[PDB]
Nucleic acid binder design. Structure first.
Lengths: 73, 50, 105, 93
RNA sequence: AGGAUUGAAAGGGAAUAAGAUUAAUAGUUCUUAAUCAAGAGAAUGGUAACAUAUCAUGAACUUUAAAAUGGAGUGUGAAAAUCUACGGAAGAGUUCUCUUUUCUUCUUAACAAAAGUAAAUUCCACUGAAAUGAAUCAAUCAGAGAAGUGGAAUUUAUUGGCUUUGUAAGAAAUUCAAUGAAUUGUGGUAUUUUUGCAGUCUUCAUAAAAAUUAAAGGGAAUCUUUUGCUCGUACUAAUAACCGCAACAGGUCUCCAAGAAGCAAAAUCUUUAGUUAAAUAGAAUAACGCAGGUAAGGGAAGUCGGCAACAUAGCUCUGUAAGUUAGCAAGAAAGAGUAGCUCUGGUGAUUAUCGAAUCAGAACUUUAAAGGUUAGGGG
RNA sequence: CUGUUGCUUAUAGACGAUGGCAUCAGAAAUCGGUGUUGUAAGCUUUAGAGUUUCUUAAUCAAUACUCUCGGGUAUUGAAUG
């Protein structure tokens, strides 16, 4: 698993065709966007809800998105 | 041992297979004298030397 | 105090059977197989350990970056920087002497 | 620091008023019994509260005295002090 | 181009971890997360030490290094365990006598990242030491160049040692409710183990090789995807699975390893785990036995012979002969002290607070104190 | 008549035997006597060297005083009831 550091690395990651699955985890403070690629599981820790919403707009429509919360799926 | 050769394990399996008794139907044949297998052994009674 | 067991079938404390006990979830301690300690490169002349090259197993240099197993210098990775300075002086000074000794002394 | 006692089911077995006289005479703020002047237990109506900030108190201390109190009147066998996860303690059978 | 075969389930070796699961297999299954091999699709920077997600070409031939190398003892970095300080959360125990009390949980993998930040060693640049300095527990070092300042590199159980981070809280542990909810701080100038490191000592002892890999000198030439075959894998490993004719008090190689107390991995007691059965019992309580003991007065008179038993026994202080290969004899011999309770002083760190068990001293009291266990008889 | 059996029976005893009683049997507690050890537990003498804290107010304190010639034990192979 690799951690991306800024937004522009994960905007570029999503618009590529190599995505395989996205899981969104909501925690007490932050939100993690664990994009599952072919090799690694890249994740982005965001601390602003507005920035989190922008990421969900950029997610393609043919890809499955899983939302995880205080209860495991 | 835990580690064993392939052929040695098959000769161990056959020794397990030959430690069986006469089936009941075979004992009901006419003029039958074979009732018990006298080639029987138990792990704690006789070591099979192999 | 949690006591552990060897995971593999080796039962003797040989050099290749080194273990490290680490902690895991719930207070359980598991067994990790730890690597052996290697030696670094040495200067071919003075036998001193070179700088800039890591001390890892010989096959692990294949996984190393191509620039992380040698130093960018003539005889890099086989000779110390002092081992090379004397090489240059020997090559130059001797050749200079052989020009005044022979060749119309 | 505020700690409330939930007698919403066993108010009859332990009426609130008997707790206050027992509680305010029992907590050892600095080693003595009954010298709880800086403790404001008050009535709390339905429940029994402490809501004291001036002195050094602990939630685990509150469960200690109550369990001691339950043994005082010999009714600990039926009851059971269980925290409500809401900075208070409630009693169950 | 160079020497054939075999020879190690403890020597060398490409690469996997956590959780769950079975009546029984699990670094092998499941979930999740990785790694390795084999493939398929003629460069810059730094004074320098040296540094740059592949980068940034490098054939024959040759060389170098790694794999790959004793032991002792001392100091020290780090992790774990134990202990302990502060701050709480949840549950349990005691409670007529007290106890803001005692106890349990508060966790995190492989592989990678690089906020913050260590110890030790070796090198590089500036300058040139004597009024000689520098430094360690010990040493040890210096004009073929010390100390100082500024740098580079490597090691420290995977990337880069520790904290932290992705993994990853969704797991797991502790509780509550009837599947669903709650929390998961920060330290220590303490001890042990493990793991490295640094120099010191020691040898008429110098403490393996290959497979395999990398680099150099040289200048010949011009991210995605597929596969990963054969065999072992159950169980005991022993006061019942092994060898002794046996469910034989005999023998048989290893790994992990809590509290008290003490110099001690000693004797003795307990915790986690295991077990209460391990060639049958009950009654009576004769002689003679096997094992463990005690004894008036005398004290080896017993006997081949102090055989057996008794006796001394830890620590501190004083003191210690003849003889001698001058090293020893020596713990010679001999004498004094030792308990409990309440106090006082010494030994440090940071600028008053914080911590280490250790030494010495003084009153008071008592059953006058190593001796429950362990523990030299002397000449 | 005698034996078994009962009193987990004694003046007896390896086992048998022997001795006693067997319904006015027997056993059991409790009580008193008789012995052993040495003054229980709770509260009180500031007993109490000192410390500590409020600053004569407490504490904590080995040991010590009164209750206390106490308490505990006592047939099990002791004696009355």
């Amino acid at each position: 698993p690799k951690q991306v550091q800024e937004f522009k690395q994960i905007l570029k990651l999503l618009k590529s065709g190599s995505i395989r699955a996205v899981r969104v985890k909501t925690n007490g403070e932050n939100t993690k966007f664990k994009v599952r690629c072919a090799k690694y599981l890249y994740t982005y820790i965001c601390a602003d809800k507005a920035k989190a919403e922008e990421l969900k707009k950029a997610i393609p429509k043919d890809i499955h998105v899983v939302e995880i919360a205080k209860k495991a799926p | 041992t835990g580690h064993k050769g392939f052929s040695y394990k098959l000769k161990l399996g056959k020794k397990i297979h030959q430690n069986r008794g006469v089936p009941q139907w075979f004992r009901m044949k006419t003029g039958n004298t074979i009732n018990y297998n006298f080639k029987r052994r138990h792990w704690n009674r006789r070591k099979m030397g192999m | 105090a949690v006591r552990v067991t060897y995971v593999r079938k080796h039962s003797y404390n040989t050099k290749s059977n080194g273990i490290r006990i680490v902690k895991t979830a719930g207070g359980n301690m598991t067994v990790q197989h730890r690597q052996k300690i290697s030696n670094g490169v040495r200067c071919g002349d003075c036998g001193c350990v070179l700088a800039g090259i890591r001390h890892i197993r010989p096959h692990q240099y294949g996984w190393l970056g191509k620039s992380k197993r040698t130093v960018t210098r003539a005889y890099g990775g086989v000779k110390c920087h002092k081992c090379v300075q004397k090489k240059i002086l020997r090559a130059f000074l001797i050749n200079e002497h052989n020009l005044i000794k022979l060749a119309a002394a | 620091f505020s700690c409330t006692i939930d007698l919403t089911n066993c108010t009859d077995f332990i009426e609130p008023k008997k707790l206050v006289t027992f509680f305010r005479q029992t907590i050892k703020v600095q080693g003595r019994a009954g010298n709880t002047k800086g403790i404001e237990v008050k009535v709390a109506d339905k429940k029994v509260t402490i809501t004291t900030s001036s002195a050094k108190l602990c939630k685990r201390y509150m469960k200690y005295l109550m369990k001691k109190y339950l043994k005082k009147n010999n009714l600990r066998e039926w009851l059971r002090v269980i925290s409500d996860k809401k900075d208070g303690f409630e009693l169950k059978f």
